[PDB]
Design a protein around this nucleic acid. Structure first.
Ligand SMILES: [Mg+2]
Ligand SMILES: [Mg+2]
Ligand SMILES: [Mg+2]
Ligand SMILES: [Mg+2]
Ligand SMILES: [Mg+2]
Ligand SMILES: [Mg+2]
Ligand SMILES: [Mg+2]
Ligand SMILES: [Mg+2]
Ligand SMILES: [Mg+2]
Ligand SMILES: [Mg+2]
Ligand SMILES: [Mg+2]
Ligand SMILES: [Mg+2]
Ligand SMILES: [Mg+2]
Ligand SMILES: [Mg+2]
Ligand SMILES: [Mg+2]
Ligand SMILES: [Mg+2]
Ligand SMILES: [Mg+2]
Ligand SMILES: [Mg+2]
Ligand SMILES: [Mg+2]
Ligand SMILES: [Mg+2]
Ligand SMILES: [Mg+2]
Ligand SMILES: [Mg+2]
Ligand SMILES: [Mg+2]
Ligand SMILES: [Mg+2]
Ligand SMILES: [Mg+2]
Ligand SMILES: [Mg+2]
Ligand SMILES: [Mg+2]
Ligand SMILES: [Mg+2]
Ligand SMILES: [Mg+2]
Ligand SMILES: [Mg+2]
Ligand SMILES: [Mg+2]
Ligand SMILES: [Mg+2]
Ligand SMILES: [Mg+2]
Ligand SMILES: [Mg+2]
Ligand SMILES: [Mg+2]
Ligand SMILES: [Mg+2]
Ligand SMILES: [Mg+2]
Ligand SMILES: [Mg+2]
Ligand SMILES: [Mg+2]
Ligand SMILES: [Mg+2]
Ligand SMILES: [Mg+2]
Lengths: 63, 386, 183, 109
RNA sequence: UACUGAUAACCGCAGCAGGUCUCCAAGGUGAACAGCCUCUAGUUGAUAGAAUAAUGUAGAUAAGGGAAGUCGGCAAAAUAG
RNA sequence: UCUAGUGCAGAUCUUGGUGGUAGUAGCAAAUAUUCAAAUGAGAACUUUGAAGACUGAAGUGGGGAAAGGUUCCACGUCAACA
RNA sequence: GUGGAGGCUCGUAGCGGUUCUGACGUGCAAAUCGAUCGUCGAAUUUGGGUAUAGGGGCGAAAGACUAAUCGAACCAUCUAGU
RNA sequence: GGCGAGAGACCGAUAGCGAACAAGUACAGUGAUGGAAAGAUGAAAAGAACUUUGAAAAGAGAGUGAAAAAGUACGUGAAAUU
């Protein structure tokens, strides 16, 4: 399959970059039918697309 | 025009072509001249180079500054398990050279030697000398008349011997086989000696003795394709040389409009067969013996083998020859030891050598110790010990 | 249609061809000559082994400044290579010919490659950009491949020409005299 | 042929990656593990777990562990059978240190 | 009025290591939008695999001597805040 | 019989086509890729996930002027190009 | 002590282009790549607009530059010039 | 030169106007300007229904045609070269 545009739409919808957007690999058929931002939003609600955990940059040694 | 400044040829032209040797075992291209008076003996022997080590000895050279003083010298060790005599063959003279007329073999050939006649031994009926061995068992018919033919003819006689490779730590399993000339007298006695020694073993103590000068004949260490600089010892061109400095700059004049054979060119370095002469034997040591590495002055029971073993070879559980200096070949290589061809008195080939000490410290590093007991005494008890 | 030169029975033969194939002419020629005259199953097994690098294709003509290997000993050469693309095209055509033979109703086990010829197809040309603002060609040299498999027949025939003989009267008399004195 | 067995092995990668380019260490570790499995099990079809890939790449390219404890499981093939009816699945084994351990068969439990 | 604004959307015969005006600009080290590391964001592109001969290109190290080298201390080293 | 734009081996001749060279030179700057699954006839290169890395805010980021002109987006899709 | 001048100075961005007479030299490139270098607040660098056109321009002057063309550009014609 | 006509011991697709064809076209150049290549299946598309191998292109058969030694890479089909 091809989910480039789905990842792009999901980034724009979630407010993050594609490097954060996580598409589950077990619902590829459910994600490829997503052609619209509204469906991307549905999939973000139901947990098929989740934003991500931000990668930490601790200031502890600095402090 | 003429060379501005004189210098000698880089390299020796009588060691050409610097090509790979046709085999890994160098062949003896000359044996000692025969005196038909002395007993029957081999003129050569087969062994495997184990490594090098360090010797101390008191020098006897009247006129030197180190007379009756201790010197340190490098020796090389050759593991010489006893050879096994399987066969002889007679050579007769012709106006086109010496020519073999017959080769008689022993009845029973061992596996390690009949592996020399196979390139794939794991898949074979092994079918070797299986009819020649049935040529025996009728009393002597097809064998004694061949021996009588060698007696009636054959100004020169050579015995076929093979190595007991299974007694070495090498994992080769295939014995080396070689022709070695006999230099006694009475070709009849030569071939009778051979017949008596068929299937039987010959030790290096019956061939070589201490303080004797010998030649080592071996194929030397291979180094592959090498450039003219290390192959011939030519000058490095200066730093700001376009298209390489590790070269010969001029490889000939305009005329003759050719590259001459005497011009240094890149190519194979190493794996040439070499004969190195006048290497004194410093010890002939037995393998039915501990304290092989002991002397009259040390008297601590230690074998010749270093701690940890000879690097890349192993142990010297068999007999051995400790011969002065450096001989061609690397460790694990088959070496052909040969008696000298001329009588060298020289006031240095006659020096009786009495060893004082033998280095048996590890060659896998900067060995501090010669024996594990010495190690244990110096270091004390360790966490491994109880 | 209009294959190359054949000496075979078209009734006991089957054919295949592939035109305008983008595959090296020089490698396909060697690959074809590697199986010319071969039994068909043996050839297919051989080509699978070439792909698996267990056997090689000998390069006889288009071989200048290529490498050496031990897998040439099988053929009496040192220069041999493993042309994957050419092998795959050739064994596709062999599959085609074998299917055509099965449709014609042939034994399917007496089949051998009786004809296989590769000839050049029109070049497919692109540009190379060189130094100092220059343009060279970058051409693919494609191939037409045709092959014909044939059933193997036993010994063909005998009974050559009548071999008429003309004798002089002297030779006839010599023959008569010998036949008189001998039997 | 027979023997669908599973075993636990230790591979010494320090001697297999000796002298290797630093940006090719871990990649060659992958290939040497495949060659290890083909040696021990006779399988040219060797599938590695991504957990093993993570274990190999945990310290980057030039930080591959000197030793690695592997669970190699020879299995019967599926997938519209290919040339070979067997394949070897290589997983990692979670253990404090892979030093001191020798090969052991694993039971079908 | 979309879009690129450039190691692929412009010009260089081309999906060319070249050229081509400008805005925003995190944490640490540190004098410092220096160099080095990291977060946000973005890439993971450039034909690959196997070996490690010579000769190269680029990087380096060398006992003792210390410019004897060379047209010439070229190059490199040494020094360095 | 008349008539001429009438006869080629060359002219670093013109145009077109084809060779040997040769499956050769080479396809090496810009730190670096790996594992699995899905798709598919087919995957070193597509997609996703996992990992390992880089640009390191005078960026391989986000925007623009000139220039380009639809390269934007989608669907289908691989004969040529990459 | 304060103060903070300078066609001052070390040194980035940038502008330039010393030396390796390095790489390349049928190149990444019909002038590039790398390192080493000059300079870096001004006679600085630079976009856009405008003016100057061929025996003419422009020139801190090298006969330099004037669209890969310069000790007289490019295009066509005289011209199938001799 | 334009419009309209008739002729030729003219040329016959590298010829003849540059152009027998979507030619002053495509394309190049900032621009003035420069400026190609490229005709022919067969009487008629009757331009290959259908089977089979193959992922497909295609192939093998079959079939159309007077001829596929005419298959939109199409009249004849030279040589170099293979
Ligand atoms: Mg002289
Ligand atoms: Mg001279
Ligand atoms: Mg030497
Ligand atoms: Mg130079
Ligand atoms: Mg040592
Ligand atoms: Mg050659
Ligand atoms: Mg070559
Ligand atoms: Mg190029
Ligand atoms: Mg260019
Ligand atoms: Mg190394
Ligand atoms: Mg808008
Ligand atoms: Mg917009
Ligand atoms: Mg935009
Ligand atoms: Mg910009
Ligand atoms: Mg931008
Ligand atoms: Mg462009
Ligand atoms: Mg242009
Ligand atoms: Mg600070
Ligand atoms: Mg700023
Ligand atoms: Mg900083
Ligand atoms: Mg490249
Ligand atoms: Mg001098
Ligand atoms: Mg004429
Ligand atoms: Mg001609
Ligand atoms: Mg002429
Ligand atoms: Mg010409
Ligand atoms: Mg090549
Ligand atoms: Mg190159
Ligand atoms: Mg797009
Ligand atoms: Mg600067
Ligand atoms: Mg420069
Ligand atoms: Mg230069
Ligand atoms: Mg060059
Ligand atoms: Mg201004
Ligand atoms: Mg002047
Ligand atoms: Mg100019
Ligand atoms: Mg004229
Ligand atoms: Mg006809
Ligand atoms: Mg016709
Ligand atoms: Mg035709
Ligand atoms: Mg011809």
């Amino acid at each position: 399959a091809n989910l480039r545009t789905q990842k792009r739409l999901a980034a724009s919808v979630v407010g993050v970059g594609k490097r954060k957007v996580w598409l589950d690999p077990n619902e590829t058929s459910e994600i490829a039918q997503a052609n619209s931002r509204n469906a991307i939003r549905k999939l973000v609600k139901n947990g098929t697309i989740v934003k991500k955990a931000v990668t930490v940059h601790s200031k502890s040694r600095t402090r | 025009s003429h060379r501005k400044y004189e210098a000698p040829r880089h390299g020796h032209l009588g060691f050409l072509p610097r090509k790979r040797a046709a085999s890994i075992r160098a062949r003896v291209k000359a044996f000692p001249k025969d005196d038909r008076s002395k007993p029957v003996a081999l003129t050569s022997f087969l062994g495997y180079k184990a490594g090098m080590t360090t010797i101390v000895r008191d020098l006897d050279r009247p006129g030197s500054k180190f007379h009756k003083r201790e010197v340190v010298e490098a020796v090389t060790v050759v593991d010489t398990p006893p050879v096994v005599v399987v066969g002889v063959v007679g050579y007769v003279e012709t106006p086109r050279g010496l020519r073999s007329l017959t080769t008689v073999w022993a009845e029973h050939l061992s596996d390690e030697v009949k592996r020399r006649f196979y390139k794939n031994w794991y898949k074979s009926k092994k079918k070797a000398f299986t009819k020649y061995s049935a040529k025996y068992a009728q009393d002597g018919a097809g064998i004694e008349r061949e021996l009588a033919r060698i007696k009636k003819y054959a100004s020169v006689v050579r015995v076929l011997v093979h190595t007991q490779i299974r007694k070495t730590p090498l994992a080769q399993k295939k014995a080396h086989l070689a022709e070695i000339q006999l230099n006694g007298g009475s070709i009849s006695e030569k071939v009778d000696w051979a017949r008596e020694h068929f299937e039987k073993t010959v030790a290096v103590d019956s061939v070589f003795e201490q303080n004797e000068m010998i030649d080592a004949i071996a194929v030397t260490k291979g180094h592959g394709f090498e450039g003219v600089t290390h192959r011939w010892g030519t000058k490095k061109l200066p730093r700001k040389t376009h298209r390489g400095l590790r070269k010969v700059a001029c490889i000939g004049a305009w005329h003759p409009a050719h590259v001459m054979w005497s011009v240094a060119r890149a190519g194979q370095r190493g794996y040439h067969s070499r004969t190195s002469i006048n290497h004194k034997i410093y010890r002939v040591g037995k393998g039915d013996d501990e304290a092989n590495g002991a002397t009259s002055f040390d008297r601590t029971k230690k074998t010749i083998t270093p701690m940890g073993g000879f690097v890349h070879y192993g142990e010297i559980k068999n007999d051995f020859i400790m011969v002065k200096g450096c001989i061609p070949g690397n460790r694990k290589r088959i070496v052909t030891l040969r008696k000298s061809l001329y009588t060298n008195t020289s006031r240095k080939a006659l020096e009786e050598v009495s060893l004082k000490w033998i280095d048996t410290a590890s060659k896998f590093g900067k060995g501090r110790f010669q024996t594990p007991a010495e190690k244990h005494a110096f270091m004390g008890t360790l966490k491994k010990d109880l | 249609a209009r294959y190359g030169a054949t000496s075979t029975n078209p009734a006991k033969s089957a054919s295949a061809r592939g035109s305008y194939l983008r595959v090296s002419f020089k490698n396909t020629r060697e690959t074809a000559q590697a199986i010319n005259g071969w039994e068909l199953t043996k050839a297919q097994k051989y080509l699978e082994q070439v792909l698996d690098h267990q056997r090689a294709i000998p390069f006889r003509r288009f071989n200048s400044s290529i490498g050496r290997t031990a897998q040439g000993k099988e053929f009496g050469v040192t220069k041999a290579r493993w042309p994957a693309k050419s092998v795959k095209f050739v064994q596709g055509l062999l599959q085609n010919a074998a299917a055509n033979a099965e449709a014609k109703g042939l034994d399917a086990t007496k089949l051998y490659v009786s004809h296989i010829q590769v000839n050049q197809a029109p070049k497919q040309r692109r540009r190379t950009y060189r130094a100092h603002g220059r343009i060279n060609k970058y051409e693919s040299s494609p191939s037409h491949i045709e092959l014909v498999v044939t059933e193997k027949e036993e010994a063909v025939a005998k009974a050559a020409e009548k071999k008429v003989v003309r004798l002089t009267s002297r030779q006839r008399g010599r023959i008569a005299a010998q036949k008189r004195i001998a039997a | 042929l027979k023997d669908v067995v599973t075993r636990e092995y230790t591979i010494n990668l320090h001697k297999r990656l000796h002298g290797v380019s630093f940006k090719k260490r871990a990649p060659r570790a992958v290939k040497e593990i495949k060659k290890f499995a083909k040696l021990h099990m006779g399988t040219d079809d060797v599938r590695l777990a991504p957990e093993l890939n993570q274990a190999i790449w945990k310290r980057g390219v030039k930080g591959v562990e000197y030793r690695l404890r592997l669970r190699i499981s020879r299995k019967r093939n599926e997938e519209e059978d290919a040339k070979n009816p067997l394949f070897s699945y290589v997983e990692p084994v979670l253990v404090a240190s892979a030093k001191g351990l020798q090969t052991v068969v694993v039971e079908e439990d």
